[PDB]
């Protein structure tokens, strides 16, 4: 079964990819080459053109992503050549530096060797390459609760966090043939952070909030033409609501709304005062203001939805079916102010795509 | 087929209804009575207890409704006895008066004779019993755009609106055997309206906004045990977002956000200022403040979601499956501040329930 799945996925991908690239005449010969390679080796190897366009297609097919207008300008870094943990580490450091680009963020993906027999060559433990640690013990909660389990796993490996609310987790990953992952501290010169201030409310800095510049998802699997790239970190720039309406606001995250209410001078006592809603808006204005002031790329949810409308229009014009997950595409503040809220989306899964995979801790 | 559907729905409803009412021992005899009645007459007649509990079950099964905690206290008015248009009119006037209850709104449903051969006895044209007219001609838009088609239909029947932004539509309904519906102007003493003011911003009254106190849906079909009550208007009280985030805010409704921004003293020029979000919050605070000040029932979305959590807990305790439509249950502002956003719901249809039906105009 394994090989037949691979071959069937390969045929569908190569045909579609080569059609998009105006290489339709080359499909026949390429598939023959591929089928012999599968027969002889159990797998096949993407050309650089296939890998690049495959990763772009995977972004285009990501139902939960509002940012897809820009799918075709993804910067694809081919690191299928790495073999050592030093090479992986340096590749991850490089992704951070080149994606950050001094604040003018470049959407980028770095692609490591794919699974072989379902056997991973490189197993990345981080959820994002840059993320804050979380701690909970004896009533005391510090940092990002979402990171508690990974943080505890890191501390099992000899790492120790300073226990501020914003400790940077080290990179942590395992190589094929190694029993334990290795970890490496992030050089702070590589990591841009943004302090959160408000355009009109001076007291907002009293909250001492900050967030990191670049979200780099590192625990999803890129699947292209039946090949499983379990290690392929990718990043865009933030939409402000991700930080202001979720990371800093969720009760199970940094839970800052009551503190926000206090510094903006409103009571947090009555549901009918809509103090949570007002606090959310001011916190979200502050996040956008702060990123802009520092010269770090960010998009607000109105502009993002307008871009996504253009993506829908572009799909129709190209004669491609549009797929999407309405429940993720609507922004978590003022969703009915966006066109997304007022239409529906087909949530079918189309490949190439990015997929969740089981965590190696937990 | 028709009769078999009826009988099958009847069996399921009577069994479930009588179990809930502790009348399980009476099911057998009641079903026999019902089957003979179907055989002899083509249909059957609900007891008052069945009709009342049926309407309550229908509310409990309404997937899109956040207000279901209170399903068991629905006030059910049995008007299966009406035969004349004067009786229907007076029944609708009475529903308005008793549901309004001087502002302390009583959730109420008035149930008219059901369809016979799929032949309606009473056909209500209004979407809600109280709603504003809408006009559009030669570039000029007045009132509620959602009402344009019904307004035009009314004006075909000899009615004429004053063309303010808040003209009350007349009641309009058709009797079996009549070719045209009749219409009746609403007595203004029956209709409570609330002027929108803001707790801290005096200029907000310059917008001259108002809304009606009681939302009374009058175009849905109540289905109970295979019987089709196409005419059965029902009401609760408003959740504030329905008015502040949708009726007054949608671009295809009253479209007031730019005007709100101006009176609250903020620029409406840059998406990154989140002026739409800020305007939405202030407009929504104003709606809640105004209803409360006037002594007209209303609920905010935080309190409503908390009540809905209790409804979920109550269902589990009673051993009933919970059904819901996530896309309608989340409020249109700060949805991620509610527990609803963070879980999923089975959107299966369970009967008794309320259903859409084709409009007789359009
Ligand atoms: C260029 C800027 C980008 C923006 C503004 C953007 C925006 C977003 C947002 C707001 C989400 C929702 C995430 C959440 O609530 O947790 C999301 C999800 C996602 N985005 Fe994008 N995105 C961008 C670039 C990218 C890129 C470059 C890729 C891949 C190559 C990507 C793939 C995805 C995927 C797979 C998800 C779903 C993640 C999950 O299921 O947990 N996005 N995006
Ligand atoms: C007691 C106060 C109530 C509150 C606060 C409430 C709240 C709501 C809200 C916010 C919606 C969404 C409507 C929209 O966005 O257009 C809704 C929908 C609905 N509610 Fe309730 N509701 C209440 C009472 C009732 C009652 C008494 C019934 C029936 C007996 C009912 C049946 C429904 C139905 C059928 C819908 C869906 C309407 C549609 O599909 O267009 N509700 N409710
Ligand atoms: C590539 C990218 C760009 C962008 N602006 N945002 C994203 C999404 O960031 C990661 C996103 C959190 N906002 O992850 C979604 C998620 C969250 C959680 C709690 C679990 C999970 N499995 N997946 C990705
Ligand atoms: C009974 C009730 C109580 C309450 N608070 N809200 C409601 C819902 O009010 C009517 C609701 C508009 N908010 O109707 C939903 C709808 C809207 C539109 C534009 C079309 C349609 N078919 N159905 C009903
Ligand atoms: C297309 C989409 O389902 C549509 O905008 C829905 C979304 N959720 C909603 N939720 C409520 N309560 N009311 C609505 O009118 C809508 N509209
Ligand atoms: C249960 C529900 O699907 C869950 O809250 C989803 C809703 N939509 C979302 N949308 C985004 N963008 N991100 C999320 O984490 C979630 N969470
Ligand atoms: Cl994030
Ligand atoms: Cl309404």
3-state secondary structure chain B: CHHHHHHHHHHHHHHHHHHHCCCHHHHHHHHHHHHHHHHHHCCCCCCHHHHHHHHHHHHHCCCCCCCHHHHHHCEEEECCCCCCHHHHHHHHHHHHHHHHHHHCCCCEEEECCCCCCCCCCEEECCCECCCECEEEECCEEEECHHHHHHHHHHHCCCCCCCCCCCCECCEEEEECCCCCCEEECCCHHHCCEEECCCCCCHHHHHHCCEEECCCEECCCEEEECCEEECCCCEECCEEHHHHHHHHCCCCCCCCCHHHHHHHCCCCCCCHHHCHHHHHHHHHHHHHHHHHHHHCCCEECHHHHHHHHHHHHHHHHHHCCCCCCCHHHHCCCCCHHHCHHHHCCCCCCCCCCEEECCCCCCC
User: Does the beta carbon of B239 sit less than 6 angstroms from any atom of ligand 4?
Assistant: yes
CA A141 to ligand 7 center in whole angstroms: 19
Q: Do domains B1-80+107-117+221-235+305-329 and B193-215+238-303 have the same CATH topology?
A: no
A76-83: list long-range contacts, CB under 8 Å, 24+ apart: A76/A51, A76/A52, A76/A108, A76/A109, A76/A111, A77/A108, A77/A109, A77/A110, A77/A111, A78/A48, A78/A51, A78/A52, A78/A111, A79/A110, A79/A111, A79/A112, A80/A51, A80/A111, A80/A112, A80/A113, A80/A114, A82/A112, A82/A113, A82/A122
Starting from the CA of residue A252, give the closest ligand.
3
Q: Whose CA is nearest to atom 10 of ligand 5?
A: B328
CA A144 to ligand 7 center in whole angstroms: 11
- Taking CA–CA distances from A325, the nearest residue in chain B reads B327
Q: How was this structure determined?
A: X-ray
Tell me, yes or no, if A183 is annotated catalytic.
Answer: no
Residues with CB in 5 Å of ion ligand 7: A 215
Both tokens of B168, joined, read: 């009350």
Mutational test site, ligand 6, from A331, A332, A335, max ligand atoms within 8 Å of CB = A332
A299/chain B closest Cα distance in angstroms: 8
CA distance A226 to A228: 6
**Class in CATH terms, A81-106+121-192+356-360:** alpha beta
Domain B193-215+238-303, CATH homologous superfamily name and number: Nitric Oxide Synthase; Chain A, domain 3 (3.90.1230.10)
B169-172: list long-range contacts, CB under 8 Å, 24+ apart: B169/B126, B169/B131, B169/B132, B169/B133, B171/B89, B171/B92, B171/B126, B171/B129, B172/B124, B172/B125, B172/B126
CA distance A65 to A305: 11
CA B216 to ligand 4 center in whole angstroms: 9
Measured CB to CB, residues of chain A less than 8 Å from chain B are: 245-246, 249-250, 257, 271-274, 276-278, 280-281, 284-285, 288-289, 292, 300, 302-303, 306, 326-327, 330, 332-337, 341
CA distance B67 to B307: 7
Among the partner-chain residues A274, A333, A335, the one whose CB lies closest to the CB of B285 is A274
Among the partner-chain residues A271, A278, A300, the one whose CB lies closest to the CB of B281 is A278
CA distance A179 to A176: 8
| Residue B148, number of CB atoms within 10 A of its CB | 17
- Taking CA–CA distances from A304, the nearest residue in chain B reads B271
Closest by CA position to B285, among listed A333, A275, A259 = A275
Helix, coil or strand: residue A57:
helix
Helix, coil or strand: residue A142:
strand
Contact A303 B335 (CB under 8 A): no
Helix, coil or strand: residue A99:
helix
CA B62 to ligand 4 center in whole angstroms: 12
Among the partner-chain residues A272, A306, A333, the one whose CB lies closest to the CB of B277 is A333
Contact A281 B281 (CB under 8 A): yes
CATH number of B1-80+107-117+221-235+305-329: 3.90.340.10
Resolution at which this structure was determined, Å: 1.8
Helix, coil or strand: residue A201:
coil
Every domain of chain B and the residues it spans: 1-80+107-117+221-235+305-329, 81-106+121-192+356-360, 193-215+238-303
Residue B172 in contact with residue B161, Cβ under 8 Å?
no
List CB contacts (< 8 A) between A276 and chain B.
302, 334, 337
Residue B130 in contact with residue B214, Cβ under 8 Å?
yes
- Taking CA–CA distances from B247, the nearest residue in chain A reads A336
Cα of B54 vs its chain's centroid, Å = 17
B319 in the Ramachandran plot: left (φ > 0), alpha (ψ -120 to 50) or beta?
left
Tell me, yes or no, if A68 is annotated catalytic.
Answer: yes
CA distance B277 to B284: 11
CA distance A335 to A305: 10
Residues of B acting as catalytic residues: 65, 68, 237, 242
List CB contacts (< 8 A) between A257 and chain B.
337
Q: Whose CA is nearest to atom 6 of ligand 4?
A: B238
CA distance A297 to A304: 13
User: Which residues are within 8 A (CB) of B326 and not within 5 positions of it... i.e. 6 or more apart?
Assistant: A327, B340, B344, B345, B347
User: Does the beta carbon of B133 sit less than 6 angstroms from any atom of ligand 4?
Assistant: no
* C-alpha distances out from residue A4 to A9, A10, A27, A42, A103, Å: 8, 10, 18, 10, 45
Among the partner-chain residues A257, A272, A334, the one whose CB lies closest to the CB of B333 is A334
Helix, coil or strand: residue A12:
helix
């Amino acid at each position: 079964e394994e090989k037949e799945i691979l071959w069937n996925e390969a045929k569908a991908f190569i045909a579609a990819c080569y059609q998009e690239l105006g290489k339709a005449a080359e499909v026949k010969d390429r598939l023959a080459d591929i089928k012999s390679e599968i027969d002889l080796t159990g797998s096949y190897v993407h050309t650089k053109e296939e890998l690049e366009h495959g990763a772009k297609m995977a972004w285009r097919n990501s139902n939960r992503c509002i940012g897809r207008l820009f799918w075709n300008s993804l910067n694809v870094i081919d690191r299928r050549d790495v073999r050592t943990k030093e090479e992986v580490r340096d590749a991850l450091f490089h992704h951070i530096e080149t994606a950050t680009n001094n604040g003018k963020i470049r959407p980028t993906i770095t692609i490591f060797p794919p699974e072989e027999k379902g056997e991973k060559q490189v197993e990345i433990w981080n959820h994002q390459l840059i993320r804050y640690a979380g701690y909970e013990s004896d009533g005391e909660r510090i940092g990002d609760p979402a990171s508690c389990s990974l943080t505890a796993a890191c501390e099992e490996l000899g790492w120790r966090g300073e226990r501020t609310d914003f400790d940077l987790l080290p990179l942590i990953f395992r190589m094929k043939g190694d029993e334990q992952p290795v970890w490496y501290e992030l050089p702070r010169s590589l990591v841009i952070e943004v302090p959160i201030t408000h355009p009109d409310i001076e007291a907002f800095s009293d909250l001492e909030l900050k967030w990191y510049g670049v979200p780099i998802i590192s625990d999803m699997k890129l699947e292209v033409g039946g090949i499983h790239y379990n290690a392929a970190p990718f990043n865009g720039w933030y939409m402000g609501t991700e930080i202001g309406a979720r990371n800093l606001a969720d009760e199970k995250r940094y839970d800052k709304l009551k503190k926000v209410a206090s510094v903006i001078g409103i009571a947090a006592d009555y549901n009918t005062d809509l103090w949570k809603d007002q606090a959310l808006v001011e916190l979200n204005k502050a996040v956008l203001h702060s990123y802009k002031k520092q010269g770090v790329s960010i998009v607000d949810h109105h502009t993002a939805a307008s871009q996504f409308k253009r993506f829908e229009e572009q799909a129709e014009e190209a004669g491609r079916k549009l797929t999407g997950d309405w429940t993720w595409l609507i922004p978590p503040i003022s969703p009915a102010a966006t066109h997304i809220f007022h239409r529906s989306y087909d949530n079918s899964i189309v490949k190439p795509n990015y997929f969740y995979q089981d965590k190696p801790y937990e």
